[PDB]
């Protein structure tokens, strides 16, 4: 689990969104595994606006932050899971790293701020849903 809190927005994995998230919905995209809801309190995270390919992510199944090299956001085939059939997920970046299903939501960050959140994985790979192109998260 986990979320990004920027401005009056909460960014979560679409497959982990709560009823309160759906009842306060701003935007959702199943192909990206992302959902954004509105919040009453202002958050403290800043979004990275860059092309970094190295950063650090939080892995809840290890209680550790790991430095990683990750691919550019792309259209990647993701195996069937409890939440989606086997399909292509867009704006996904892959890295070598430990992940388990409940690791979704962990933040990947670089020197500029938050880059995205854990969304996929298995067999020593971890995939992150990018948020750097969502410029509207910085305003309103
Ligand atoms: C850290 S994810 C992971 C790790 C180990 C094994 C399996 C997984 C993938 C689990 N997933 C991927 C999500 C998606 N974005 O399609 C939906 C879901 O249930
Ligand atoms: Zn950066």
Q: Where are the domains of the chain?
A: 3-44, 45-140
Tell me which of 21, 91, 103, 104 is the catalytic residue.
104
Phi-psi region of 108 (alpha: psi -120 to 50; beta: other; left: phi over 0): beta
Question: Hey, what are 64's tokens?
Answer: 């550790």
Q: Known catalytic residue: 59?
A: no
Q: For 15, phi and psi rounded to 5 degrees?
A: -70, -15
> Was 110 annotated as part of a binding site?
yes
CA atoms within 13 A on the CB side of 73: 17
Nearest alpha-carbon partner for 30 in 97, 106, 91, 73: 91
Catalytic annotation present for 104: yes
Q: Is 15 a catalytic residue?
A: yes
**3-state secondary structure (DSSP) of residue 2:** coil
Ligand 2 centroid to Cα of residue 2, in Å, is 21
Q: What is the resolution of this structure in A?
A: 1.3
Q: Experimental method for this entry? A: X-ray
The count of other CB atoms within 10 Å of the CB of residue 40 is: 6
């Amino acid at each position: 689990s986990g979320a990004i809190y920027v401005g009056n927005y909460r960014v979560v994995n679409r497959h982990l969104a709560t009823h309160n998230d759906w009842a306060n919905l701003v935007w959702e995209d199943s192909s990206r595994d992302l959902l954004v809801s509105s919040t009453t309190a202002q958050g403290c995270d800043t979004i990275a606006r860059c092309d970094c390919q190295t950063g650090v992510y939080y892995c809840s199944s290890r209680r550790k932050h790991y430095p990683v090299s990750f691919s550019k956001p792309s259209l990647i085939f993701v195996e069937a899971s409890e939440y989606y059939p086997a399909r292509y997920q867009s704006h996904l970046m892959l890295a070598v790293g430990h992940s388990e299903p409940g690791d979704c939501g962990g933040i990947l960050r670089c020197q500029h701020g938050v880059v995205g959140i854990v969304s996929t994985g298995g067999n020593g790979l971890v995939g992150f849903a990018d948020v750097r192109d969502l410029l509207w998260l910085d305003e309103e």
